[PDB]
Structures are given as C-alpha cells and as structure tokens.
Amino acid sequence: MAEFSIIDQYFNRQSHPDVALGIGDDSALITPPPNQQLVICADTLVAGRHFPLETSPHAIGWKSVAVNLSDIAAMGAKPHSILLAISLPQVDHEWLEGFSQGIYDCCNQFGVALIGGDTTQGPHLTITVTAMGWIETGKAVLRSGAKVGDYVCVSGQIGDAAYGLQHLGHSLQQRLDYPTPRCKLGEELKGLASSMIDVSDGLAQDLGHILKASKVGARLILEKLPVDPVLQQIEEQQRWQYALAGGDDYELCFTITPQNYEKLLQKQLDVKITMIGQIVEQTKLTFEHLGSDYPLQIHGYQHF
Amino acid sequence: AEFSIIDQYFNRQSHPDVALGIGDDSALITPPPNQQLVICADTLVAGRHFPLETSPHAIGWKSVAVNLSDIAAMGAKPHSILLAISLPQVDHEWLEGFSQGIYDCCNQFGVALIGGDTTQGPHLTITVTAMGWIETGKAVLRSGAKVGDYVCVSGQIGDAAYGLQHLGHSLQQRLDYPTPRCKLGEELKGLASSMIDVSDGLAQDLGHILKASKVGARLILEKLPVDPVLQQIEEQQRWQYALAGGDDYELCFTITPQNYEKLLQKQLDVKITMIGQIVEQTKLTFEHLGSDYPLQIHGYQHFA
Ligand SMILES: Nc1ncnc2c1ncn2[C@@H]1O[C@H](COP(=O)(O)OP(=O)(O)O)[C@@H](O)[C@H]1O
Ligand SMILES: Nc1ncnc2c1ncn2[C@@H]1O[C@H](COP(=O)(O)OP(=O)(O)O)[C@@H](O)[C@H]1O
Ligand SMILES: Cc1ncc(C[n+]2csc(CCOP(=O)(O)OP(=O)(O)O)c2C)c(N)n1
Ligand SMILES: Cc1ncc(C[n+]2csc(CCOP(=O)(O)OP(=O)(O)O)c2C)c(N)n1
Ligand SMILES: [Mg+2]
Ligand SMILES: [Mg+2]
Ligand SMILES: [Mg+2]
Ligand SMILES: [Mg+2]
Ligand SMILES: [Mg+2]
Ligand SMILES: [Mg+2]
Ligand SMILES: [Mg+2]
Ligand SMILES: [Mg+2]
Ligand code: NA
Ligand code: NA
Ligand code: NA
Ligand code: NA
Numbered sequence: 168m169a170e171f172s173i174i175d176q177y178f179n180r181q182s183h184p185d186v187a188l189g190i191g192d193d194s195a196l197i198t199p200p201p202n203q204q205l206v207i208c209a210d211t212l213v214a215g216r217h218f219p220l221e222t223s224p225h226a227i228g229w230k231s232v233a234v235n236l237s238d239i240a241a242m243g244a245k246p247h248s249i250l251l252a253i254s255l256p257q258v259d260h261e262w263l264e265g266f267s268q269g270i271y272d273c274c275n276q277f278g279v280a281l282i283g284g285d286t287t288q289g290p291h292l293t294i295t296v297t298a299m300g301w302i303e304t305g306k307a308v309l310r311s312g313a314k315v316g317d318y319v320c321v322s323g324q325i326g327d328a329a330y331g332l333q334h335l336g337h338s339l340q341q342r343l344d345y346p347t348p349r350c351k352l353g354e355e356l357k358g359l360a361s362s363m364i365d366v367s368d369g370l371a372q373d374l375g376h377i378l379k380a381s382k383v384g385a386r387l388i389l390e391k392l393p394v395d396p397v398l399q400q401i402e403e404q405q406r407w408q409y410a411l412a413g414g415d416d417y418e419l420c421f422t423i424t425p426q427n428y429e430k431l432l433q434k435q436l437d438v439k440i441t442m443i444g445q446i447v448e449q450t451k452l453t454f455e456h457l458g459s460d461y462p463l464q465i466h467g468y469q470h471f
Numbered sequence: 472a473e474f475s476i477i478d479q480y481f482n483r484q485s486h487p488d489v490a491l492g493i494g495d496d497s498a499l500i501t502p503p504p505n506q507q508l509v510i511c512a513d514t515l516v517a518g519r520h521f522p523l524e525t526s527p528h529a530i531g532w533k534s535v536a537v538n539l540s541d542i543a544a545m546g547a548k549p550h551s552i553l554l555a556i557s558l559p560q561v562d563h564e565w566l567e568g569f570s571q572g573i574y575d576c577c578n579q580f581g582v583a584l585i586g587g588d589t590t591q592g593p594h595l596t597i598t599v600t601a602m603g604w605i606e607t608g609k610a611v612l613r614s615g616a617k618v619g620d621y622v623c624v625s626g627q628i629g630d631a632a633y634g635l636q637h638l639g640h641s642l643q644q645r646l647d648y649p650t651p652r653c654k655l656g657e658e659l660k661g662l663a664s665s666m667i668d669v670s671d672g673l674a675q676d677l678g679h680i681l682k683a684s685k686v687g688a689r690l691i692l693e694k695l696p697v698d699p700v701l702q703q704i705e706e707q708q709r710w711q712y713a714l715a716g717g718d719d720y721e722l723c724f725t726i727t728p729q730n731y732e733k734l735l736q737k738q739l740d741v742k743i744t745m746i747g748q749i750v751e752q753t754k755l756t757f758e759h760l761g762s763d764y765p766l767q768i769h770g771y772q773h774f775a
Contacts, residue, residue: 170773187507191683192613193544193668194511194603199502204490207585208497209512209553209600213592241496250512252555252598258774282510285598288773289516295555295588295598297512300497310495365496380494470473470591471561 168258170286177267178251183280186248195282197248199301206244206300206307210235214292218344219335224262226344227294228269233348234367235298236277237417240353241365243308244300248280251296254289277350306357308421313362313381317422319444322349324393325370326406329413339397346417352438353419359431360421371411372467374420375452381422387444389456389463407454407463414468422446473589476561480570481554481584489551489585498586500551502604509547509603509610513538513670517595521647522638527565529647530597531572536651537670538601539580540720543656544668546611547603551583554599557592580653609660611724616665616684620725622747625652627696628673629709632716642700649720655741659724662734666724674714674755675770677723681755684725690747692759692766710757710766717771725749 168176174190182189188196199205212231214220232249239246251270274281279298327342334340349365356363362381364373370392378385389403392410399406423431431440444455454461477493485492491499502508515534517523535552542549554573577584582601630645637643651668659666665684669676673695681687692706695713702709726734734743747758757764769775 169775173774188610188612192610193541193666194509194547194601196545196605196610197508197510198607199506199508205500205502205508206497207500207553207600207602209555209586209598210588211555211557211590211592211598213557213590216591238496242499244497250510250600252512252514254514254516254596283512285512285514286773287514287516287519289514289519289594289596291592291594291596293557293592293594293596295512295514297510297553297600298497299508299510302499304501307491307499309491470589471476471558 173258173263173286177263178281178284180271182282186280186282189282202304203301204304206239206242206302208235208238209295209297210238211293211295222344224265225269228266229273229345231294231296232270232273233346234417235296236279236348236350237365239298239300240348240350241363241419242302243306243353243357244302245354246277246279246298246300246350248282248299249274249296251281251284254287254293256290308356308360308363310362310364310377310380313377313383313422313446315383315446315448317361317424317446318428318442319374319385319387319422319446320440320442321366321370321393321418321420322352322438322440323418324395325366325416325418326394326398326409326413328415329409330398339395343415346415348417349419349438352436355434355436356421359427360423363419363421366416366418366420367414369412369414369467370420371452371465377422378452382450384447384449384451385444386447386453386455389454389461391441391443393439393441412465412467476566476589480566483574485585486583489583492585505607506604507607509542509545509605510600511538511541512598512600513541514596514598525647527568528572531569532576532648534597534599535573535576536649537720538599539582539651539653540668542601542603543651543653544666544722545605546609546656546660546666547605548657549580549582549601549603549653551585551602552577552599554584554587557590557596559593559595611659611663611666613665613667613680613683616680616686616725616749618686618749618751620664620727620749621731621745622677622688622690622725622749623743623745624669624673624696624721624723625655625741625743626721627698628669628719628721629697629701629712629716631718632712633701642698646718649718651720652722652741655722655739658737658739662730663724663726666722669719669721669723670717672715672717672770673723674768678755680725685753687750687752687754688747689750689756689758692757692764694744694746696742696744715768715770
C-alpha cells in the first residue's frame with residue numbers, strides 16, 4: 168500500500184457541500200463568503216517535541232487540528248477548512264486509521280472540512296496543518312489594541328497540560344493530549360476583546376506578545392489564575408510555574424474593557440472566563456500576590 | 472532562537488495585497504471580488520526531495536516553485552504563501568541563503584510570504600502552502616479531457632531526472648531550479664480542457680487526467696520534448712527519463728484542436744509541444760515510428 172492508496176484509504180472522506188473543490192486535484196477551491204476576510208495559519212507538530220513519542224495516533228491527529236483551530240479562534244474568526252501535510256517513516260494501517268480518526272473527529276466537532284494536503288515519506292514523523300477561517304471584514308481581534316485599563320482575562324484553566332506532561336498517566340494528561348480550541352468563545356469575542364492571543368507557549372510569554380504589540384504593560388494577580396484543583400494543592404512556586412510558563416494550554420488570553428467584560432459575562436459560553444489582572448501604562452509584566460508586589464522570574468517555551 | 476529567526480530572515484514587508492501579514496496568530500487576506508481561493512501544500516524532505524548537499528538557496532527556491540506549480544496547474548494566479556520549516560540546527564549562513572531562495576522565487580512571480588511556522592526537528596522538512604485566485608468557476612481541472620483533444624506539455628521533460636543521476640551536469644539546474652509555468656497556466660484558463668503539473672512523471676501525471684476524465688491517450692514518443700543531451704542517449708533510457716523521471720514541474724494539458732490554434736496565437740514565455748491525443752479506449756499507449764511501442768513505466772510514489 169503506497170502513497171495514493173493511503174490518501175484514498177484514510178484522508179478522502181466526501182467533501183462538504185460548502186467546498187467548491189476538495190481532495191483530488193492539484194489544489195482545493197473555496198468560494199469566499201461575501202464581505203469576509205480569509206484568516207489563515209499553519210503550525211507544525213514534530214514527534215517527540217510537540218508530543219511524547221508514545222502518544223496515541225488518535226490524539227496526535229486531534230491535536231494537529233486543534234492547535235491550528237486555536238490560532239483561528241485567537242483572531243475572532245470562524246474556522247472553515249484545513250490542509251494536512253504529513254511526513255512519516257512507515258506505513259502502519261493501525262496508526263493511520265487512528266490518526267485519520269483523530270483528524271476527522273476534531274474537524275467534525277468544529278464543522279471544519281479537510282480539503283487537501285500532502286503525504287510524504289520522511290525519516291521522522293512531522294505534521295503540518297494549514298487552517299483557514301473567515302471573519303467579517305475589518306473585525307479581526309489583533310494582538311495590538313490592548314489599552315490601559317482593560318482587564319486581562321483567560322479562558323478555562325492554565326497549567327493543566329504542563330502538569331500532565333510531567334505526570335503521564337494522570338488524568339490531566341487529557342489536557343496535554345486533547346486540548347480544546349475555544350472556537351465559539353473566539354467568535355463571541357469578536358467586537359468585544361481589544362486584543363487576544365492563544366496560550367500555546369505559556370501565559371506570561373503569550374501575554375507578553377500582546378504587551379509588546381500594544382506598547383502597554385500588565386499587572387497580574389497570582390491567586391486569581393484559574394488552575395485545576397490538583398495544582399491548587401501543590402506548592403505555590405511550582406503552581407505558578409505551571410500556570411504561567413507551562414504552555415500547551417490552547418486557551419484564549421484577551422484584553423477587554425470593564426463594560427465589554429460585563430456584556431461578555433451576560434453571554435452563554437461553553438467555557439469558564441477568569442479576570443486575572445489589568446493592562447497598565449508601564450511597559451512591564453508584573454505579578455501581585457496577597458496585595459503586594461511579587462518578584463517572579465519566568466521563561467516560556469521557545470524553540471532552539 | 473525561534474523568534475529571532477522569523478524576524479531576521481522571514482519578515483520582509485508584507486506587502487500591498489495583504490491585510491495582515493506576519494506577526495499575529497493568523498494572516499488576513501481580503502479576497503479580490505469574483506474570485507475563488509486556490510490553495511495547496513507540498514512538503515520537501517531533505518535527502519528525498521533534494522540531495523542533502525543542495526545549496527540553501529536552491530532549497531528555498533524549489534520549496535516555493537513546486538507549490539506555485541500546483542497553483543498554475545489550475546489556471547490560477549498565485550498570490551501568497553505560508554512557510555513551515557522544521558530545522559535541526561540554527562545556521563545563519565544556511566538561513567540567509569534559504570530565505571534568499573524563498574524570496575527570489577516569490578519576487579519572480581509576484582507572491583508574498585505572509586506567515587508560517589518555525590520549529591526544531593531532527594530532520595530538515597519544509598512545507599509551503601500556496602494561495603492563488605481564479606475567476607469563479609473557471610478552474611482547469613484534472614477532469615474534462617475529451618476524445619480528440621490534443622495532449623500537450625510545456626518546456627522539456629526528463630531534464631531534472633537526468634540531472635539527478637548526473638549531479639554536476641548543467642541539467643542539474645533543472646533539478647535544483649524548476650520553473651513553475653505561472654503565466655502559461657493563466658493563459659490556459661478557458662483554453663485547456665484539463666491540466667496537471669508534471670511532478671511525478673509525465674506518464675503517471677497524464678494518468679491522473681486519464682483516470683479522472685475516463686479516457687485514454689496515445690503518445691508519440693519521438694514528439695516528446697527532450698533536451699539535446701537526452702536526444703543523444705539510448706532511446707529506452709531517454710523515454711524513461713522523459714516519461715517516468717518526474718521533477719519537471721512543466722504543465723501537461725489537453726486542448727481541442729480549435730483551442731490549440733488560439734493558444735499558438737498568444738505570445739507565450741515557454742515552448743509548447745503537442746505529444747499525442749485523447750482516445751476513447753481507457754489506456755495509455757505509446758507509438759514510435761508509426762507503430763505501437765510497448766513500454767513499462769513507473770513514476771514517483773512515496774512508499775513505493
Ligand atoms: N494527507 C492528506 N490529506 C488530505 N489531502 C491530501 C493529503 N495528501 C494529499 N492530499 C490530496 O491528494 C491529492 C493528490 O496529492 P498529490 O499527489 O501530492 O498532488 P500533487 O502531485 O498535485 O502535489 C491532492 O488533491 C492533495 O491535496
Ligand atoms: N518561517 C516562517 N515564515 C514566515 N512566517 C512565519 C514563519 N514562522 C513563523 N511565522 C509567523 O510568525 C508569527 C509567530 O509565529 P508563532 O509564534 O509560531 O505563532 P503562534 O504561536 O500563534 O502559532 C506568526 O505570525 C507566523 O505566521
Ligand atoms: C514531548 C513534549 N515535550 C515538550 C512539550 C511541551 N511543548 C512542546 S511545543 C510547546 C509550545 C507550543 O508549541 P509551538 O511550536 O511553540 O506552537 P505555536 O506557538 O507555533 O502554536 C510546548 C509547551 C510537549 N508537549 N511534549
Ligand atoms: C535526493 C533525491 N532523490 C530523489 C528525487 C526525485 N524525486 C523526489 S520527489 C519526486 C516527485 C515529486 O515529489 P512529490 O512529493 O510527489 O511531489 P508532488 O507530487 O506532491 O508535487 C521525485 C521525482 C530527488 N529530487 N532528490
Ligand atoms: Mg500537482
Ligand atoms: Mg506557530
Ligand atoms: Mg499556534
Ligand atoms: Mg503533493
Ligand atoms: Mg510557539
Ligand atoms: Mg497563536
Ligand atoms: Mg505538487
Ligand atoms: Mg507526487
Ligand atoms: Na501558525
Ligand atoms: Na509551532
Ligand atoms: Na499539494
Ligand atoms: Na509531495
């Protein structure tokens with residue numbers, strides 16, 4: 168079984184009616200919805216670096232899609248379709264069946280179509296997914312735009328996936344293996360959030376991209392960070408390391424005025440929202456604990 | 472480090488046809504009116520899609536070229552690319568040459584680099600996503616070939632496959648620096664009845680058209696456009712390079728006699744050769760000096 172049978176056997180379910188031309192030709196074709204901009208991103212997952220080597224093939228496929236839908240959500244946009252480029256050393260039916268199942272389970276959960284890609288042989292498992300979304304023209308939430316006085320907020324919990332990586336077997340491994348892209352929240356933040364980013368590297372480092380892009384600073388309250396009860400029971404130091412520098416969260420961190428935060432809380436959401444601090448004028452990220460300044464040194468995930 | 476790599480090598484101005492380029496979670500494109508998005512992605516694996524010692528400039532060039540080739544194969548105009556690279560080491564001399572190759576190909580064809588992803592991985596792997604636009608409904612597909620249509624191919628075929636086995640020969644330039652036939656693809660909109668780019672080998676790639684169109688073809692072996700160097704080698708090897716070599720990135724297309732006459736009236740920037748015609752019998756056969764010529768051909772396939 169070779170390249171072309173592989174595509175047909177695992178990556179060629181019937182295309183959505185809303186896709187002008189799916190898998191089968193030199194490119195895919197999409198008809199843009201009217202009065203909307205294309206939103207596009209791509210992220211690579213390297214075996215043994217973005218996930219443990221023994222990660223289940225289903226989880227590998229899920230996360231490959233999930234982390235890229237998360238980057239669409241971080242813009243306020245609605246995801247539409249993906250391309251899948253996979254390089255793998257060996258043809259393993261069992262692995263490919265479970266991997267394609269994770270691809271399609273994530274796509275199906277968020278209404279996304281798989282419309283093309285590329286399948287190659289290479290010595291190390293390497294997956295690049297390109298994601299495409301659409302957004303009302305002009306309405307994208309940027310990493311710039313945060314203003315002094317805006318609240319700093321984050322969805323869900325932070326630190327779960329990082330704790331899980333260090334405690335494989337623990338229930339919190341599910342947050343490492345199966346992050347949830349906050350797609351509907353991202354769309355609900357269109358027109359409310361003044362800036363936004365998804366927490367892939369670590370909350371402090373990813374907030375920092377907003378602070379640099381907006382030429383502002385932020386003061387965070389450590390005891391308001393939303394952590395899992397398990398992390399609430401570990402020592403404070405390691406708890407805040409996990410929460411602020413763990414990464415792999417794929418939650419949304421955003422800024423928002425107090426008035427728009429009240430409108431956001433009136434909405435029906437599928438995820439917890441926590442206000443964790445405020446944007447300030449001084450161009451520094453600082454931490455507060457029990458009403459006093461808390462010095463804290465911290466580094467997020469960077470390749471190389 | 473990762474963030475310095477992007478800023479130093481992959482962050483040239485955006486440019487004008489791009490609402491939001493590099494620096495956010497996704498890129499933003501305002502679609503031109505009355506046009507469909509054309510999108511594709513191809514992966515290059517070091518030591519497999521190019522000799523390990525290929526210059527970084529040629530690696531960058533080809534990474535873009537092979538993807539513009541799949542846009543050209545639809546009759547579409549290329550617009551922008553994303554670049555996903557997994558690198559074992561940070562090498563500034565390599566990165567300078569590679570990024571220069573990326574941009575030299577983009578600049579030659581009016582294409583913007585609007586985003587991507589940079590990761591560490593044990594083996595050099597590059598996936599470019601290419602985006603183009605086509606007047607709605609006017610894409611040239613792999614289906615559509617009709618009995619009586621001529622089979623044509625641009626340029627020369629076999630050059631790159633010869634160069635790969637004769638590294639150091641002048642024809643290595645066609646391996647290292649294929650030319651995507653962008654303008655020709657555009658000029659075949661409304662003229663070609665079907666089209667594919669010849670990445671795997673003319674016989675196999677024409678085979679994809681034959682299967683999608685439910686027709687066959689008869690090719691005239693002495694009409695195949697080969698380099699003078701291949702004209703001087705034994706004819707069996709000549710035909711294997713020409714028909715199963717791959718890596719040509721020429722356009723193979725079908726066209727009515729009537730529309731072929733119109734194509735010739737255009738001032739084209741590449742040679743065009745009529746090499747045979749579509750027939751009812753659903754087989755690819757070869758003819759040489761007026762008689763059937765049996766030929767066993769196997770084009771490129773991963774895991775084969
Ligand atoms: N893993 C994949 N998932 C989805 N579609 C894929 C995948 N690999 C390839 N494809 C699709 O299968 C078709 C054949 O792929 P390919 O032979 O690589 O095309 P080309 O030779 O034009 O680059 C294309 O339509 C491509 O987008
Ligand atoms: N090699 C590259 N070429 C072009 N753009 C790139 C490349 N690598 C990353 N980018 C861009 O740099 C920015 C930051 O990348 P990254 O930190 O990986 O984003 P994210 O964490 O949201 O996935 C993005 O805008 C991305 O599109
Ligand atoms: C085996 C293993 N080691 C380490 C990690 C942690 N990790 C890997 S990548 C990463 C950051 C997210 O990946 P990146 O490539 O930076 O994604 P992007 O910012 O492009 O979305 C983290 C915290 C992991 N998930 N698995
Ligand atoms: C070192 C090396 N070995 C072999 C080849 C030949 N080769 C590699 S890939 C390929 C076909 C084109 O690659 P593929 O991944 O199938 O591209 P696609 O069809 O997706 O465009 C050929 C002929 C090469 N260029 N370099
Ligand atoms: Mg092609
Ligand atoms: Mg990224
Ligand atoms: Mg990302
Ligand atoms: Mg391909
Ligand atoms: Mg990152
Ligand atoms: Mg992001
Ligand atoms: Mg291709
Ligand atoms: Mg191929
Ligand atoms: Na990305
Ligand atoms: Na990444
Ligand atoms: Na492709
Ligand atoms: Na390929």
